[PDB]
Assembly symmetry: C3
Homo-oligomer: 491 residues x 3
């Protein structure tokens, strides 16, 4: 007659890592790293992204004629721009503080284009001749839609003085520009006056622009340049303009009607007619895992990004093909013990069977669950990357930005890989201890009434029927009741 | 007759968390987190802060007339500005590189304001008419004290050419300005000259300023603006000015006498004629704990900031409501034992009583004490936030700043919280180990001169006088000497 | 007759630290921190650095006459500049965007200077009068070599118009300048024309410069100033210049022919005629070690920098001067067991000896080296500091940079020291555990055929010849056979 302490084995090939041993097969594991995406740009909680196709943000806001698709756009969840849009500033030049502007757009979900200065407001200047073959529309010269390129009328450009007062209740993005002509003759020919300026005044803005009449390379057919500027006009402030030439006046402006979470993804992946809680530049994520390795730049309800390829938490025991029990003095585990991690096998008159020890098994489930939860929960406050953009002469700052973001990525990747690695080791040892402690609880009850065989089995010196077995499995084994019989059975 | 091995218990309610278990009641515990402050701004090693009340630094340094409390100030330890001061640039305008000037102030403890250009040096310009309702002093029109607003005299403004040589041994901080007039009639009424400039030369500076005469919004009731500039004049260099108009000239400048470690604190909490070695914006800290959670931006000899609400190290044992002793084969601890952590319980005919094993108990104290100390020391070189400032067109750099400073708080919080969780688990297991080893040291002496009861108790098979039972704790025991009595009682 | 279990001891004095105990002698250890460097600057994998002596980068690129030895420079591995070189900008002024230019050089290994505008190209200007006492060469007034200070000829400065087209297949760095004269008179003596400008145009550049004629301090004997500008001219683009005075025109320009990892290194250390795979500003490093503590800023294949004095890993066991065995119930280790880490000593009528358990020892070695490797491999992706540069008005950003690099440094120093502490403690307890498990393996085989002395040793109850002793060590000990003799000997 005998009773045995043993543990679970099953047909698992799930594998796990520790500091001392790699690729350890365990009975149960939990993967915590999301490795797949759907290869598509999607809606984000049923709000579709503004996809700019081949337009730059600047092309959109100034109203490049190739960007008409975007003349009026519903509220967006995120903005999508290609790496090198082709439609962007058809007439060459620049948008000042372009990247600071894009930084504003990343907290904006909706604009409403309003007309603030109609062509009616310009009766002594020419509002229709301000076009270029650099900005074709329908096989003819055209221009940016949101601004007007004012030209002289009757061989005269009298001085413009116009104010505009923001009587909307929201912030207003206004854009305007200056034209740098190529030479003294071109300047007379467009504007009459040789020497010219633009004055722009706000409560906070005080700007004076003067044309640089100079010789440059042809870009998109033009040696001329147009430099654009912008400002937020707060509710109840006014903007004042003065110019006696080279002025590219605002026609429309953008009222900021909804702020919130957004971003400007750089991506050329297609829209997928689908919805998601979480979007990256390479595809969207449908997952409950705490971590992923898809891309550092995400928006939505997101797993936390790390640079790993595998990240599995051991929950159960080392599987069969520090405390000395598991794969030690108990040689392997039991396929036949299906209903618990640790338990008993008994052999007697009435036969045999496996039975989980439920108390000690619940303890271990409790603890392993709280470990997983503690590990998930501690990694809620990791770093999250944010796209920021830098122009050509901010390379120091761009490099600093990149190192800082990679810096935290490496720290958080290390922290995650190592915590898993260390806690896996502890989890295997925990199991090994739980089993040694179970074997010891039995050893202590029996004492001299049975022989330790040294492989985790107790051979009884008396007869142990089924209710005597259940007595050992629940810690109520009456030692005196069998001691005499046990006495006799020695020698 | 029995000896027992057991462990301390008490009435303590102090709790600690581990990876597998939250809210574990333990006997002893050391909080390491500071959660209170005195609610007041104080002196810092006897040196008082400069409290600008409702003045900005710009207001102080240019000498807004509503800031006359600060016309001459003693040495300071730190500076305290409200979040939004009402008394800034009274006459609307700007102070160029204002954020950089303030960064400089963060390493200055004292200025000596000095006269460098006396009003008597302007024979040929009016020095008395340079006042404005936008700078009221008691309802009357005034102007910034530290600079002077020259106007025409006798419908004339001749060209100014003056120098100042810095013959102090200290660096000097000099401010000057330019006035932007509203239109050409105004320009002629203040200065005579319609077209004007200001030149400024040092060994490094080479500035030309030209007025932007334009229409602007009114602020503080003025449509005009004043743009102020600053340089640091080295201790044998000279500054050279030239102007035929619009010049706001230096009268006073600031000698940089004491450099040191300061900061500019944003706070509205009140002064309290007190003294500390560590100050935050919400109040002062009187602590020797190694961590606090009051505010990120301290100055002084301070603990290290974390985002935790709780941070308690376990020192002692699991309290009674891995190595299988504490709350294993030994039910519970002993309220009765006082002078120790691990010990013994008599039970012979002379009586009973509790004895501590002072060797074991000591090796534990040494270990736990050195753990706490090793932990505190490893956190000496965490991250200390600085309070950098940024303007309205430096939002990307401000976002970078915010993000990395937060990132480091989240890194150090994760580190602090996890180290405590891990070492807490290791601490309780250390106690458990110590108990087990003590029990084994005593089991291997008795051999079969006692019954292993299996609850930590040893029923002898002979008779132990106090003389004898003290021979167990020492380690000194003769097995043969008491063997005789055994086998007779055994059978 | 007896057999004892024990472990290795030796004459090693190597120490290591754990959380609970500092300076523990162990039998083997592993330094992982390189602490020593050769105090010299060296070739990097065969390639000599460019050492500027007391020339600045500005000096070199503009061609200061004191910097003549850098007219034609071979491919370099890194650049070395002193902290304040004395030959920089002999004629006072500035180089615009100097820090951004250095940033660019940090990715360049080789330029090829080429003549792009020969002196024959200025038939109607003076090409030989543009010299100054501030740029002496061999006792004569002179000038920068890579540009030309054009002055009037025959009391005339005809307006200059000139283009240069980058017909090379390589990017071209071009430098030019404007001279700020001190007054109207001087302006006339040099250039006939009182009011002058410079226009520079590329596809992307649009510059207008006007001289600031003003009073300034003398520097190197001169009150005038020269402001230099630079651009990268892409293949197949052209640069266009127009001036009528104060132009410092290009003569030579630099083709960028080799790009890769470089760095501009601030150092005064003498070159040492020698080679290295890793270089720092204070000396070169030849190391196998994974970590070092020499300098943050390093170039080459290097260790990872940490701010620590000691970093030693435990591999062997506690040395003789948690699991209960090592320095527990087995008091000390054994100088005489030399073949391995854990083993047996036996003592029988045929004598005595030591034998190492190869199976225990080998498992132990595997685990410990896998741990050492695991730790080293987790420390691959630490943060690498980078030299970046900032002017006198970028102090916030400088300071954000300092605190960010110092922040990552302190994080990784913490991660390394604490990983070492934590796994040392584990390594020691692992040994402790391997010994215990080996004791208990023997105990189980002998059962009651022997007496546990409680000190690591089994006093047999029968006669254990040499073949019997090899039993116990093999794990083949035959309990049946000796059973009776053993029984008889208990009496
Ligand atoms: C020196 C001077 O003329 N001060 C006058 C100013 C200035 O003319 C404008 O501020 C110029 O922009 O206007 C007013 C005012 O500010 O109350 C009256 C005041 O006497
Ligand atoms: C690798 C393998 O054989 N997997 C099996 C699975 O197919 C089966 O469903 C399960 C029992 O439910 O046992 C496991
Ligand atoms: C150390 C080791 O065993 N390496 C293996 C790898 O080669 C194998 O491909 C993978 C699963 O297949 O598991 C890991
Ligand atoms: C700068 C400016 O003129 N803003 C005006 C403001 O003063 C006025 O209160 C408002 C109401 O119509 O219109 C706007
Ligand atoms: C500059 C101006 O017109 N002043 C007005 C004020 O009289 C009016 O009460 C208010 C209405 O918004 O706006 C401001
Ligand atoms: C001692 C023994 O026979 N085993 C007992 C059983 O009788 C009892 O009913 C059960 C509680 O449900 O616990 C066990
Ligand atoms: C998981 C858990 O038990 N957390 C508890 C919390 O709910 C309770 O309010 C607090 C009071 O001391 O102690 C802790
Ligand atoms: C004008 C100037 O820059 N600083 C001068 C310095 O050159 C001169 O030697 C010194 C003599 O008193 O006075 C100061
Ligand atoms: C500290 C010490 O004694 N060092 C010695 C070394 O000099 C000697 O060569 C070796 C003998 O094998 O043992 C070790
Ligand atoms: C706390 C302590 O024991 N520290 C000592 C230290 O003083 C000694 O100089 C060092 C090198 O031998 O090793 C250890
Ligand atoms: C900016 C410029 O003029 N670039 C020219 C290019 O247009 C021309 O095709 C080539 C060869 O003649 O030289 C280059
Ligand atoms: C006395 C004894 O145990 N010796 C045997 C030996 O004959 C056998 O060859 C060896 C295997 O390596 O192990 C064992
Ligand atoms: O030119 C407008 C003027 O209006 C009135 C006032 O007193 C002056 O300060 C000036 O601003």
């Amino acid at each position: 007659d005998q009773i045995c302490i043993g543990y679970h084995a099953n047909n698992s090939t799930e594998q796990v890592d520790t500091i001392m041993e790699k690729n350890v097969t365990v009975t149960h594991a939990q993967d915590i790293l999301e490795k797949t995406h759907n290869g598509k740009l999607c809606d984000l909680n049923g709000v579709k992204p503004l996809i700019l196709k081949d337009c730059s943000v600047a092309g959109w806001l100034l109203g490049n004629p190739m960007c008409d698709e975007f003349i009026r756009v519903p509220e967006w969840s995120y903005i999508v721009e290609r790496a090198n849009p082709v439609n962007d500033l058809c007439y060459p030049g620049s948008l000042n503080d372009y990247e600071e502007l894009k930084h504003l757009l990343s907290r904006i979900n909706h604009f409403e284009k309003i007309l603030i200065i109609p062509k009616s407001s310009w009766p002594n200047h020419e509002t229709s001749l301000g076009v270029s073959a650099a900005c074709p529309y329908q096989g003819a010269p055209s221009f940016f839609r949101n601004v007007v390129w004012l030209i002289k009328k009757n061989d005269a450009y009298p001085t413009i003085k116009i104010s505009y007062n923001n009587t909307n209740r929201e912030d207003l993005l206004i854009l305007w520009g200056i034209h740098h002509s190529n030479n003294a003759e071109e300047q007379i020919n467009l504007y009459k006056n040789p020497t010219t300026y633009i004055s722009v005044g706000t409560s906070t803005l005080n700007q004076r622009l003067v044309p640089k009449i100079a010789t440059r390379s042809q870009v998109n057919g033009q040696r001329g340049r147009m430099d654009f500027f912008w400002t937020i006009l707060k509710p109840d402030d006014a903007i004042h303009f003065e110019s006696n030439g080279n002025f590219i006046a605002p026609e429309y402006a953008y009222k900021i009607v909804k702020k919130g979470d957004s971003t400007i993804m750089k991506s050329g992946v297609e829209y997928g007619n689908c919805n998601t809680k979480c979007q990256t530049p390479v595809g969207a994520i449908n997952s409950s895992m705490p971590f992923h390795n898809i891309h550092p730049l995400t928006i939505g309800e997101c797993p936390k990004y790390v640079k790993s390829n595998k990240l599995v938490l051991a929950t159960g025991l080392r599987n069969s093909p520090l405390f000395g029990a598991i794969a030690g003095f108990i040689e392997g585990g039991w396929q036949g013990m299906v209903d618990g991690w640790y338990g008993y096998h008994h052999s007697n008159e009435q036969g045999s069977g496996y039975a989980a020890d439920k108390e000690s098994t619940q303890k271990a489930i409790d603890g392993v669950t709280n470990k997983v939860n503690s590990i998930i929960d501690k990694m809620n406050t990791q770093f999250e990357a944010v796209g920021r953009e830098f122009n050509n002469l901010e390379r120091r700052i761009e490099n600093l930005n990149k190192k800082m973001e990679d810096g935290f990525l490496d720290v958080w990747t290390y922290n995650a890989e190592l915590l898993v690695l260390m806690e896996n080791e502890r989890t295997l040892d925990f199991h090994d201890s739980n089993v040694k402690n179970l074997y010891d609880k039995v050893r202590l009850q029996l004492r001299d009434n049975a022989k330790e065989l040294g492989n985790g089995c107790f051979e009884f010196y008396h007869k142990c029927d089924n209710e005597c077995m259940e007595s050992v499995r629940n810690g109520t084994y009456d030692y005196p009741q069998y001691s005499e019989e046990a006495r006799l059975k020695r020698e």
